[PDB]
Amino acid sequence: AIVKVTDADFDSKVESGVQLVDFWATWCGSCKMIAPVLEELAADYEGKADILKLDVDENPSTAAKYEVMSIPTLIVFKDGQPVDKVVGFQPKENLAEVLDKHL
């Protein structure tokens, strides 16, 4: 459902279409809270948008490149460009509202 992305293949996976990238970490409690919401959202947009996860501890440069200071942080990419940003916990509705705003 939710595909993993790293510093090595980021530019590769995030370049065409709309992607929602979830910056998280194992020590992040609210990130664990958002996880299930994303797995569901990922289903609602199968074929419309891709949902990726990037562990900031193992991929700090990509986190640095997009100014991700706190987490969870979710960034909406369109054709390789960051076009929207969501911080902290957010219910399914709000996240879908952000995606439709770019599809």
Side-chain angles (χ1 to χ4, degrees), residues 10-11 55-57 73 95:
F10 196 79
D11 304 305
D55 182 314
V56 301
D57 292 331
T73 289
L95 297 181

Side-chain angles (χ1 to χ4, degrees), residues 41-45 47 49-50 95-96 99-100 103:
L41 187 67
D44 299 352
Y45 291 70
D50 302 348
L95 297 181
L99 287 180
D100 301 318
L103 287 176

Side-chain angles (χ1 to χ4, degrees), residues 6 23 30 44 54-55 80 86 102-103:
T6 63
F23 296 74
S30 57
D44 299 352
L54 179 146
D55 182 314
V86 176
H102 300 299
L103 287 176

Side-chain angles (χ1 to χ4, degrees), residues 23-31 33-39 41-45 47 49-52 54-57 59-64 66-77 79-84 86-91 94-96 98-100 102-103:
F23 296 74
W24 69 294
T26 55
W27 43 266
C28 179
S30 57
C31 297
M33 226 62 190
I34 282 186
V37 179
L38 294 179
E39 299 183 305
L41 187 67
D44 299 352
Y45 291 70
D50 302 348
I51 298 184
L52 323 179
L54 179 146
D55 182 314
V56 301
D57 292 331
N59 303 289
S61 67
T62 297
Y66 295 100
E67 308 298 319
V68 176
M69 303 308 176
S70 65
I71 63 175
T73 289
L74 302 163
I75 298 186
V76 181
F77 285 80
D79 299 311
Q81 295 292 307
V83 302
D84 223 317
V86 176
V87 186
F89 185 80
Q90 300 292 308
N94 287 300
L95 297 181
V98 176
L99 287 180
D100 301 318
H102 300 299
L103 287 176

